[PDB]
């Protein structure tokens, strides 16, 4: 699904309270960092002689996933972000 590379979506910022063209960037999930509260648990829990200690999800059924779109008005840094429908090939242009 082709998506515009820019959109005048509405802006919650006080500086705005208005429609503004938003620089669209696709949301790609950030790196899974080591010292996340719950990675430290999983690591502590994987220390020792129980093998795997938590389930590892294996069987995906979804082929697609929701395409979060981070946005940001020219005016300021704040990144409004909004979901779309599932697509096998999001690609803004």
């Amino acid at each position: 699904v082709n998506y515009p590379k820019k959109k005048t979506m509405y802006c919650p910022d006080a500086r705005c309270k208005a429609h503004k063209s938003f620089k669209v960037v696709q949301y790609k999930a950030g790196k899974a960092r080591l010292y996340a509260r719950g990675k430290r648990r999983y690591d502590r829990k994987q220390s020792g002689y129980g093998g795997q200690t938590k389930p590892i999800f294996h069987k995906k059924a979804k082929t697609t996933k929701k395409i979060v779109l981070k946005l940001q008005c020219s005016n300021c840094k704040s990144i409004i972000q909004n979901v779309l429908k599932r697509t096998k090939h999001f690609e803004l242009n």
Partner: protein, 203 residues
């Protein structure tokens, strides 16, 4: 203040002179029995901290101990039941190596009563702790107020009961307060005290 010199000379175990002296010993100690009595401590100043006194009825012993982790003595290395309880090589003995050396000695020689042990040397394969056993029935011991507690039957095998300083180390008793509450009279005593089902008589 000769102790102050001999104590800081041993605080430099990594110094090449002390590293050389220790080298020759560990060589020299490898070619000796696992227990070896000494007429004198290798570390007179350290033995004396731990209560050794050059008196009749104080004797010193250098007890060897193989280094490295315990291999759990399951047959063919197999382990049964849950996967957690598997693992042969990596689980470690929950007991100190000063403790094990104080216990080897005190069990070989029930004649005596170990007071403390201290680290003496440690090559790749072995650690040597020189124990300071007291002989309970030497008259010098029996009659000295500073030491004759050891004579009392309550300390027959202090080390086997983990009462010596080493055995208090792995027993967690080097910590008062919130770091050793689950541990504190004993891990066992802590357990009774928390796992008892108290029934107050009138509830």
């Amino acid at each position: 203040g000769a102790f102050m010199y001999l104590n800081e000379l041993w605080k430099k175990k990594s110094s090449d002179v002390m590293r050389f002296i220790q080298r020759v010993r560990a060589w020299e100690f490898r070619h000796q029995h696992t227990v070896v009595r000494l007429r004198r401590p290798t570390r007179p100043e350290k033995a004396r901290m731990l209560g050794y006194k050059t008196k009749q009825g104080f004797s010193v012993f250098r007890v060897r101990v193989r280094r490295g982790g315990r291999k759990r003595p399951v047959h063919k290395g197999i382990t049964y039941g849950k996967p957690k309880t598997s693992g042969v090589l990596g689980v470690k003995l929950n007991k100190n190596s000063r403790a094990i050396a104080e216990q080897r000695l005190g069990k070989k020689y029930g004649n005596l009563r170990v007071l403390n042990s201290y680290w003496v040397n440690a090559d790749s394969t072995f650690v040597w702790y020189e124990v300071v056993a007291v002989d309970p029935m030497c008259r010098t011991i029996r009659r000295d107020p500073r030491i004759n507690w050891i004579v009392n039957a309550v300390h027959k095998h202090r080390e086997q009961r983990g009462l010596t300083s080493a055995g208090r180390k792995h027993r967690g008793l080097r910590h008062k307060g919130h770091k050793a509450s689950k541990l504190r009279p004993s891990v066992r005593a802590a357990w009774r005290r928390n796992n008892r089902m108290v029934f107050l008589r009138k509830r």
